Design a protein around this ligand. Structure first.
Ligand SMILES: CCN(CC)c1ccc2c(C)c(CCOC(=O)NCc3cccc(-c4cnc[nH]4)c3)c(=O)oc2c1
Lengths: 215, 215
């Protein structure tokens, strides 16, 4: 039960080349066969590569799979980008028994200029505390492409439980907005020195921190 | 070069049994293993059946796979149907020359109960005021069905500029979440006694109010 690690997102303009990596965690990449699946928004998945570099019939020559043994990774390289190439791409391999999927990479064929997110982190409101709630909100607006990943820290430990993040939506300025909220009890919020929201967009990561003591 | 044919959609009410078929166009259904995947929109898919009828751990035993050699099909049967089973389901098999997916079945669970939204209004953070911004966020969560309308007030008067509301998205609890944010200047925020966010859902309105606080 090993892991395959893919970038969360990639972008390029029409006619360019883009590459999506898939790094094996503990194992030997050439030990087992890697597949690549395309999923366009609102569509069924489609095999574009099997057995590391084989193209199914009807998949164009612009899709190419490869293996790097020294880096222990698989790559999908797409040349001559077209707007229809915009989709989620997932790598997949095998152990002695086990099937392992990568977490997926969103490929945007740029339809507008790139824009980095505005990120604002809010501490609990006085009113929700009296309701025994210490929900923190991380507002993420004015970004393009519409792909972000959010990670929360309690002090400096990753927080797993309590996190929700909305699907990015296009706003009146034609850029995306989303919010992530962490549903703390007041006891959990007071019991730490600070909490942090990390937002990754186009592989650039920003971090904001709030604390019970900040006046 | 065979195809797998599943219904586009199916609907059923809670506690009932639903069946999703997957018909192989050419060759025998039993010549290659069939997998079933569940996918909630915004999320990556999960494996619910492999090798025709094997369940990974963490998959409820309410999920069962089978083969019918005579109708040349595979079936996913979900018994004791629950709201969280609402999702897209894909079958998948092998061509030796390809990995083949069905077209996907969107399963609708009927008769989900109305749920009123939780509404939390956050005043500007100290850090954004120091960067000359006074954005308010109104976090709206746990509502069903997935539509609200938001109106903002400055003192008692309607706000007509600077409001954005995200498109509601279904969260892990199968209820919807959205944020409305009002992009104020520090001057606008301090020149009023309060701002209010008013959320309407299925005829009921909830109103929350925040005021500049003297730190
Ligand atoms: C769109 C492409 N696609 C096909 C529907 C994906 C795309 C991504 C995924 C991911 C990330 C997971 C979660 C991680 O799953 C795994 O690593 N393995 C799944 C699994 C678990 C147990 C048994 C099997 C299995 C399948 N055949 C034999 N054994 C597979 C997953 O389970 O399924 C995925 C399917």
């Amino acid at each position: 039960n090993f892991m395959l690690n893919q970038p969360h997102s990639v972008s390029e303009s029409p006619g360019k080349t883009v590459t999506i990596s898939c790094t094996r965690s503990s194992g030997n990449i050439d030990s087992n066969y890697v597949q690549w699946y395309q999923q366009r928004p609102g569509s069924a998945p489609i095999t574009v590569i099997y057995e590391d570099n084989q193209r199914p019939s009807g998949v164009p020559d612009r899709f190419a799979g490869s293996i790097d043994r020294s880096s222990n990774s698989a790559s999908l390289t797409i040349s001559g980008l077209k707007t229809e190439d915009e989709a989620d791409y997932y790598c997949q391999s095998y152990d002695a028994r086990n099937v392992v999927f990568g977490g997926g990479t969103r490929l945007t064929v740029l339809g507008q200029p790139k824009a980095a997110p505005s990120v604002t982190l809010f501490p609990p409101s006085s009113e929700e505390l009296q309701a025994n709630k210490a929900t923190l909100v991380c507002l993420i607006s004015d970004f393009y492409p519409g792909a972000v990943t959010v990670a929360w820290k309690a002090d400096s430990s990753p927080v797993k439980a309590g996190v929700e993040t909305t699907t990015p939506s296009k706003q009146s300025n034609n850029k995306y907005a989303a919010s992530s909220y962490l549903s703390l009890t007041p006891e959990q919020w007071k019991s730490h020195k600070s909490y942090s929201c990390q937002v990754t967009h186009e592989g650039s990561t920003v971090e904001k921190t709030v604390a019970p003591t900040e006046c």
